[model samples]
Target chain A: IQRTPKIQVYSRHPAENGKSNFLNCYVSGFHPSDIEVDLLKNGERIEKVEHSDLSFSKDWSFYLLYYTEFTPTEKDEYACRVNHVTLSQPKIVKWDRDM
Target chain B: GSHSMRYFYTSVSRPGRGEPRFIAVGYVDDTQFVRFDSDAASQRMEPRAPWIEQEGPEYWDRNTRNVKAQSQTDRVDLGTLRGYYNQSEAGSHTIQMMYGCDVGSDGRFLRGYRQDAYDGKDYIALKEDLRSWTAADMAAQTTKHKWEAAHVAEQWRAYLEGTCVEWLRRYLENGKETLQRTDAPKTHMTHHAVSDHEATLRCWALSFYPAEITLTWQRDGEDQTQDTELVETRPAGDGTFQKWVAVVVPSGQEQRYTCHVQHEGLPKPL
Candidate 1:
């Protein structure tokens, strides 16, 4: 009943210049399936993003990952926000620009 | 054929290291039970104790004192314990007892034990020693653990003489046609420029199953094994797996470089 979510961000293609790429947000190791996740571009939330089906870990724990496609423009910041019952408030994780 | 049973206890520990260490392993068979400890007792304990008083004082002392002390140290260092029970004709069962202190930060404040059970179904959380369990489940745990312990020997015999032997016969009878392959991996190559003349080429083999796939790099039809690093294959959080291999090359030589991937599912290397 007690578990913490691990969030990570990575890209399939380099997010340099103006190249089109997919940004992946992996959220794993959390318990109790009901949770909310969203992608934020700059300071605004993006409405359209792909969310994967909830998957079970080898130990039977639950997890999920989400991704969005976009072309890097200027110094844009992308982040992922997650809300779960275990959290007192929403948790936000930012994608590193250098990554 | 005669039936037999075997039990195995394997323990791994990681105080804080690059890789977890297999600290202890114990094996029990029909005629003998032996424990091997890599960390403390490097010697094997055979007929670990004196079966008869006439065996001599040395035999009794070694079995009673040396073996016991060695086994205790092995368990203590293991921190967390995992065990397996196998019955020759029936099936097999596995159990894990993990200590909170071994689980890191989440377990720092929590001072209890976690036990897991698996018998083909989803891993059942047997007990969180810190939390309360229903009376019914608690009784069930007793029965499960007892049965697991008692059946280990039978399970081993059944596996070897019954199911395992039968499986081999069937495998041969069926002409080994059961070797079915899954879908081929999707391969892609990309490069990230390190500088004006230097670049790192990454070859990815993604969305493959069975965990048996190979990825390599080649330049101008020659294998580029040197200076290439391949990351461990990781699950894609689904049923498939993904891996990447990277190599440093001159930026302009991209045209001569190719990512070669091979999997049983693929008709030809990609």
Candidate 2:
């Protein structure tokens, strides 16, 4: 039951400068359920984040979401960070400017 | 702060895999507290929350019988709609009933709502005061017209405003350790660019309980509620809730804006 999660970092709305929106890091397909997911800014963990209940697919793999309201900017680096029993190191997913 | 009690009952004319013919669930806030499944042998209302078990057998007995009757009515509703549509029965069709009530911490009635949907679309919605129902389609109009003539509105008001809120207050007190107390949200502030010169500052509140929260974006001590749209607070799936608000300002001036978080869980706004 050890599996790595499929991770994605995306914006709720299309990316534009000076607009309001949300940034979500959805982590799915993991197993064992003992995992940590986080949304980070500028290489530091955010002050607070919204987390989804850990749920599983029909196939029994686990999933969760880490999200926050974010205003996209060129000065800041936003990322999704995950820790799973299947991985030796933390998994990092980057947010490229959205379409 | 406000607390709520809501229920959803769904019935399918034909069922899909891993789905039941009929199912009903109740929530106190975002936490599911009770459920009814037509698949059950006795068609009983089962406890989903530990606090729900405090009610004696008389409570469960009456509630079970009520939902069983509802299950029968839902089956008829689906069948009637199917005939109304004059459609092939080869595919699965559905009907859903959603109803709820909200109350403030002081037990004052806040609001109540009820709606019915057929095949995932709105069929009818009872208005704020429950004086009448809003029909979504021609078929719904026919049903609405019939129900209105029967004076169903008054009965609905009796249940939604009185019985519903009374039960909500009891449940809140029953789950006093968990549901009655407030849990502060973890707040975050971030912004993205919408235009070259303007920045949309976002304020997010996460994992808070008793879901009545006020998220405001202030500019140098001035209140700014009109600058942008506010999103409805949503459940986080673990008995807590999340909310986000945004304000757009010019590039350098973004630093002058701050997001304020207020909830019954906290003594002071942050």
Candidate 3:
């Protein structure tokens, strides 16, 4: 069986725009045909974007620079998934302050 | 220039199981410099395959981007094999194996090389990964699975034998002026800008003898105290020193940072 494409989250830099953040994923041994990116917010799909070949080096080490501008509320979840196999688990960039 | 190879030795032993020990012999060779003609018409070599395949293409096809073209000068411990066997004297013997790469740039000198150790674990992992491909994967690449496996095996053998030999070769070729330096208490300084909101500081210490070391963050000679993350240590191959890289996110306002190295038997801290 072919191994599922794996995503290694090297670094995540959240921007102040609330809706958008900078995410870098190291997609190793990824097939040229199967590259994709999906953004989720609070267990709901926010945006789905197909990765262009330009963002990657000739070696296929993809460096995705995406700006996700969404106002983060209390306990908001933001995540990026690759090849539809795994979402960066769901990470909450913002926490609820009311409690 | 023709390259000559020398083998150091090989070990045969396994852990727990009755499997025989694998063998790893080190090897190295010296080559004379030759200038290559470069022109606008010169074509670039095709990329090589990948080292690992998870959910994408085969391993060989994946690593093609790292391929480069070089003349076949000399191969050390090129083809190596491992098998389980019974030993008369030791009841059963197990072996771990490894090899490495060290190349010099000049025409007639061995400048520098890297040393790597491989055991039955690495050997088995490599073989298992390589087995995932079919004839299609092999046909797509110049160096097939068997050839790639040979390269991996030979490098392991060469690492074990060439360790001492490469050192001696470097000493003979350029002893005093060699790039390898033994200056005690060396330090590598790294600086990073902190975002205004973040309260944690991150940093690391590296390459000091006698593992015990300390890193402190102080702003303008005054220490801003916060819980510091534990520094992780990684040992270098030659066993000369251990490398440490750590991060300390400041709990509050702070600026300057410093990593202190205190080795055993030294009077003042370095």
Candidate 4:
């Protein structure tokens, strides 16, 4: 029996402003038995803190850093995927400086 | 003539109203049926001595008087028949009455009317039939659901269209075309407004690929015409990235400031 791949998302760094974050998805391929993780900035992988049935959420999912420190810089290129299926093709989530 | 061996059986059911009104008069000698709610006031006599009743002069006296039974769950049983008169108002009453019998192991069960003085020889059967328009009711319910679905869809479309139009206008000419030949450049932008002052504009540009991306801000087709603030890119959910750029401008400069987005296919103003 072939087992489906386990995937998750997390942050690379500690949260700046005592906030929390997690990954969200409307993944179609995986069932309730899939492994998931959230990969964040600062080389951190915040694993399975929360999940949603819908593809959307009110607050940012994974990183709980302050808006000022976590704001998208020119060098930022964030990406999201599930079992190799990607929602966003790695791009910045915050406002870009060089317009 | 009187019966030595007597047997009497009575049964009642709520057939509701507005269907068909009936009154059953049965006997060992002969069986008779009557439509009570049809005419104003009517009674029939069976010639058989067993079925015929010694009608007291007061029989017609109680005519047109209301004789109602104790109310039960949406229906009322007239109870054991005694003697009484019944009346209804116009065509407002439409009820169904039935009479029948079934053979039991012991003997046959008598059905319908019977003659007994103490047991109310003649009793009135009353039923308050509720009116129902099933088709009309269903149509009204369906119309309500349709309206609800339409309202929800309208709200969703408004939100999606607002986001889509804003994204397209900033990056593509006439809201269509890519910065490059094949790939559309990803544009990063945010809007800020404060009362009694000029709005702040911020934006960034990304190459088709994720690793090679550039961010920039401009006002009046020139870079850094106003005070610009560059911020670090924030990590979004699922390992994606985001950033912010703030530029301050004077009041009444709405037309003068535009966030130009340059991508792969349509690198120019879109």
Best by lDDT: 2
iRMS, all models: 11.3, 12.3, 16.3, 32.2
TM per candidate comes to 0.38, 0.60, 0.27, 0.23
Error of 2 at B193 (Å): 14
Residue A86 shift from truth in candidate 3, angstroms: 14
Q: Model 1's lDDT to the true fold? A: 0.52
Q: Return whichever of 1 and 2 wins on DockQ.
A: 2
List model 2 lDDT by residue over B1-270, tens digit each: 588898877776653454427777788876779888676776689998889998999999999998888888887777678777887756567677778899986998899888877765678889997898999888988899889899888888999899999999999889878877778878777778878988787787877887679988878887887776576565454567677888888998987788888987788777
Q: How many steric overlaps are in each model, in order?
A: 12, 15, 55, 69
Using TM-score, rank the candidates from best to worst.
2, 1, 3, 4
lDDT of 2 at B207: 77
User: What tens digits encode model 4's per-residue C-alpha lDDT throughout B1-270?
Assistant: 110111222222223443222222222211111111211254322222221234344432332121112112113223211111133222121112221222222332212211211111222221111111111233333433553555533433342234323322322222122111233445655566655676666664432322123455556667763477754443343223443456777767755655654433455534
Worst 10 residues of 4 chain B by lDDT: B126-135
Give the DockQ of candidate 1: 0.02
DockQ of each: 0.02, 0.05, 0.07, 0.02
For model 3 chain B, give the 10-residue run with minimal summed lDDT: B67-76
Candidate with the larger TM-score of 1 and 3: 1
- Candidate 1 chain A lowest-lDDT run of ten: A52-61
Query: Which candidate wins on TM-score?
Result: 2
What CAPRI-style quality would you assign to candidate 1? incorrect
Off by over 4 Å in 1: A1-24, A29-36, A47-50, A59-61, A67-76, A81-99, B1-183, B206-212, B216-243, B249-258, B268-270
Q: Compare the candidates by DockQ and give the number of the best one.
A: 3
